[PDB]
Amino acid sequence: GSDISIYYDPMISKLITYGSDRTEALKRMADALDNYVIRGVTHNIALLREVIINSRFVKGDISTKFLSDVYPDGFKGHMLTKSEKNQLLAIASSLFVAFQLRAQHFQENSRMPVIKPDIANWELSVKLHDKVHTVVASNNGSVFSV
Amino acid sequence: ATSVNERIENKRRTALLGGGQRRIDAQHKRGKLTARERISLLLDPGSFVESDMFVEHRCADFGMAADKNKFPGDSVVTGRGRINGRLVYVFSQDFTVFGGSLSGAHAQKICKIMDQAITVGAPVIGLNDSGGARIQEGVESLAGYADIFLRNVTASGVIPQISLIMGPCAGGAVYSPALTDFTFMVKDTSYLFITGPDVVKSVTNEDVTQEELGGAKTHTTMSGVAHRAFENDVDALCNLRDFFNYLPLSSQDPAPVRECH
Amino acid sequence: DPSDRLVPELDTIVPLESTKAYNMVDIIHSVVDEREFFEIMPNYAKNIIVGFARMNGRTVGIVGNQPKVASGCLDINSSVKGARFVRFCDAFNIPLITFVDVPGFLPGTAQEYGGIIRHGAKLLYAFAEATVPKVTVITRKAYGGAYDVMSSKHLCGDTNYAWPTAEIAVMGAKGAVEIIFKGHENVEAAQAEYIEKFANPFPAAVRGFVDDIIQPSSTRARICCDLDVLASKKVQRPWRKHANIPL
Amino acid sequence: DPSDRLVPELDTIVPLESTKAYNMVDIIHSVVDEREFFEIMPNYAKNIIVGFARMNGRTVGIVGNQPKVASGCLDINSSVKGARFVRFCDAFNIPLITFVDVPGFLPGTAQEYGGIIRHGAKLLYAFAEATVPKVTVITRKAYGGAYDVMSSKHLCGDTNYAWPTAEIAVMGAKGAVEIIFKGHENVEAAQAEYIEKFANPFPAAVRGFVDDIIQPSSTRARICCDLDVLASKKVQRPWRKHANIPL
Ligand SMILES: CCC(=O)SCCNC(=O)CCNC(=O)[C@H](O)C(C)(C)COP(=O)(O)OP(=O)(O)OC[C@H]1O[C@@H](n2cnc3c(N)ncnc32)[C@H](O)[C@@H]1OP(=O)(O)O
Ligand SMILES: *C(=O)CCCC[C@@H]1SC[C@@H]2NC(=O)N[C@@H]21
């Protein structure tokens, strides 16, 4: 319910993590930053997450112009790799199929009984960025094979 | 050796295409789908049962008795299906055959499907894309319109009735959606007016386009006739399918209850 | 028994020629669950068969014409038996499945003196007043008023199908041509046209008197689904203490 | 979505000053299941919001005022749009939830010449004949006859709730003091007493016009439980063929 106004600073919050060493601290930062919920305003969680898992930041060699040179044109987001792209597509397809399956769970009517569809494999077209992927999703309970 | 068996699939193939492949190509060029693929996109896969596939109009005047004017189905596809496992009765008007004009057989099929729906107690969904009454039929089209209106009024409050206008609907074809519970529209491809712009210009001396006179924006912004407007055909079918889950199948049933997490 | 069990054995059970007969109980056995059928009066009025079976586990009453004996023609005993069975099935919310292969009522003075009209009215009333779901399949033929008496669509029937070898007409082509064409004194073109245009199920379908023309192998799978939808059928009729059966 | 989910961001959504507006769609999203709301007529008569949502898995109809557009006033288009939706929801056993923030009807000669009385009567009748469970929440204000038109307790409403910012008053304070205190010429104090005594939900709550004054953060948990106990609501009314809608 708190609102952000033009009068004061844009500081939403201050997240801190502590660990035995630097790697543990960075892992805790990533874990706590992926599990942090803000809805209503636009935050810079993407920038912090990309900076934390940056290879140069992990190695150590940083400067006061670290943010300026790693993104010359500007911020773009997370350039997810092939495996990460496949994981994201599988997660999205599984979520879509789960919503579709949940849509069919009505209470018993006793006058107009329902006949739940028995779709074995869901064939889906997923458009991400500017690419179309063909996905085959199957469900056997709480497990999805994509 | 009998040709009736061959005639079975002959008329089946002629009915599946409707009024020809050229008109289907024109429909696709207009950015619109045909009735059969609309129904396939609306209902659960492998659940559509069609009724009155071989029904043709009885007109025998003004050259409509010719073999080239006899289309099996007569500009409408009627049947039953299931949405998320729930029974529904659906009809879709075929603009390919005679511009969707409603003949005696068209109204007969609609009345039959509505009667079956009201007997079993299931909702009715109508995809509206039609040019109005067929002049060649004569007063038969008016009788069919009156029968559909009477069934709409009788079924009002008994079973839900949803109408989705997907093309230029003019004349009497605009009163049936108004008698239904909810009216949905497709932007840039659906119209709803009683008289066309030409008649308005000839009578009232005013220049107006079809989109301005009866477009989706006009009926969803400053008229209050339609309830929602959707981007295109596929989005309209998806949103209608989502909306159908909210309503009960009949007034004899309580409000639907789903699973919460 | 699965509700979508295909039955290809019914594809060629109806002989091509109209003078050859077949057994109706074979269709009944192939259509119903586990091919189990409890027949009623199996040895009395054998031109009609009635009994109890199960479709998708639900009890169904079955009435059909038997073309083996008397060519499937209706008579006094057959009409009475069918009417009584149909009335019982309707009275206890049992759906009715009808298989129609009938050329009419057999002639003769013994039927007229015995009151064949009253018993035809019996059976016609029995199918007329039924409010249970009714599924009708026309196998070979349905001629004249008997077609109306055999649970036609216009008789508040729920769903009517016709096989590709079905045929609906007022009567056979010979009598129709004789009563219509008398001044032409030629049968070379009249008979051919009448056979090509009124000896097939298309006149009934084009007027919408049958819902669809289905392949025989899809009969069972077609009926079961219809029995799933028609379970909640409900109709209203004018109030009365009772009606006058033509008994 | 758990039925007893707390909704704390509604605790300060209503501004302290009465001249500043807010969005009712935010409250609707915060209250309903999974923050999913199918809005009906979203681009027509925006000073009223109608739609379908779900509470504890049960579909419900949502009708609310929109202070963002036209200060939440009622007019012809909003009256018709709300009335038909309420009639449909009542006709098909769908519960109704109303959010009330309205200063009254929109004045002017254009509204009077268009028949604002008839459409206000339409909306009032639509809420009046409803036999489905009705839950009402007053957010900021409900002035004059509009308070009756928005499913008050006296229209056979089931549950009525008021937030701490609610103001159930006959009319505005200035008009009230100008019609009561005419020759007193000492309105400086009269404002103080009138605001301290009647600019709050206390006059309505002291005589049972609202069931309770609830914290906004407990709104959802308050509604669901009601919808649990009102699912078996059943009332009887005098027989008639139909009524006379004021169309
Ligand atoms: C009030 C109760 C009644 O009796 S209403 C009777 C209908 N009154 C009318 O004035 C019909 C006016 N129709 C039209 O203006 C157009 O067809 C409308 C509906 C605007 C279609 O727009 P558009 O997208 O451009 O398609 P189109 O004009 O190219 O039409 C293609 C084919 O459809 C046909 N069509 C349409 N309506 C009828 C009709 N009522 N009766 C018979 N045919 C109709 C047209 O003949 C046309 O045929 P063709 O393919 O061009 O040869
Ligand atoms: C203004 O409303 C917020 C005051 C706190 C910000 C001040 S001003 C700039 C300095 N930079 C920073 O992070 N805090 C200081």
Swiss-Prot record, chain A:
According to its UniProt record, how is this protein modified after translation?
Acetylated. The biotin cofactor is covalently attached to the C-terminal biotinyl-binding domain and is required for the catalytic activity. Biotinylation is catalyzed by HLCS.
Q: Which residues carry this modification: N6-succinyllysine?
A: 65, 76
Q: Where does the record say this protein resides?
A: Mitochondrion matrix
Residue(s) carrying N6-acetyllysine: 59
Q: What does this protein do?
A: This is one of the 2 subunits of the biotin-dependent propionyl-CoA carboxylase (PCC), a mitochondrial enzyme involved in the catabolism of odd chain fatty acids, branched-chain amino acids isoleucine, threonine, methionine, and valine and other metabolites. Propionyl-CoA carboxylase catalyzes the carboxylation of propionyl-CoA/propanoyl-CoA to D-methylmalonyl-CoA/(S)-methylmalonyl-CoA.
Q: How does it assemble?
A: The holoenzyme is a dodecamer composed of 6 PCCA/alpha subunits and 6 PCCB/beta subunits. Interacts (via the biotin carboxylation domain) with SIRT4. Interacts with SIRT3 and SIRT5.
Recorded domain comment? Consists of an N-terminal biotin carboxylation/carboxylase (BC) domain that catalyzes the transient carboxylation of the biotin covalently attached to the C-terminal biotinyl-binding/biotin carboxyl carrier (BCC) domain.
**Clinical condition linked:** Propionic acidemia type I: Life-threatening disease characterized by episodic vomiting, lethargy and ketosis, neutropenia, periodic thrombocytopenia, hypogammaglobulinemia, developmental retardation, and intolerance to protein.
Protein name, entry field: Propionyl-CoA carboxylase alpha chain, mitochondrial
Instruction: State the species of origin.
Output: Homo sapiens (Human)
Included range, full protein: 438 to 583 of 728
Curated annotation (Swiss-Prot), chains C, D:
Q: Which GO terms describe its cellular component?
A: catalytic complex; cytosol; mitochondrial matrix; mitochondrion
Any one biological process term the GO annotation gives: branched-chain amino acid metabolic process
Q: Where in the cell does this protein reside?
A: Mitochondrion matrix
Primary location recorded for the protein, binned into one broad class: mitochondrion
Residue span of region Acyl-CoA binding = 33-66
Q: How does it assemble?
A: The holoenzyme is a dodecamer composed of 6 PCCA/alpha subunits and 6 PCCB/beta subunits.
What family does the database annotate?
Belongs to the AccD/PCCB family.
Q: What is known of its domains?
A: The beta subunit contains the carboxyl transferase (CT) domain.
Q: What does this protein do?
A: This is one of the 2 subunits of the biotin-dependent propionyl-CoA carboxylase (PCC), a mitochondrial enzyme involved in the catabolism of odd chain fatty acids, branched-chain amino acids isoleucine, threonine, methionine, and valine and other metabolites. Propionyl-CoA carboxylase catalyzes the carboxylation of propionyl-CoA/propanoyl-CoA to D-methylmalonyl-CoA/(S)-methylmalonyl-CoA.
So which disease is it linked with?
Propionic acidemia type II: Life-threatening disease characterized by episodic vomiting, lethargy and ketosis, neutropenia, periodic thrombocytopenia, hypogammaglobulinemia, developmental retardation, and intolerance to protein.
Q: What is this protein called?
A: Propionyl-CoA carboxylase beta chain, mitochondrial
Q: Which organism is it from?
A: Homo sapiens (Human)
Q: Which residues of the full protein are shown?
A: 293 to 539 of 539
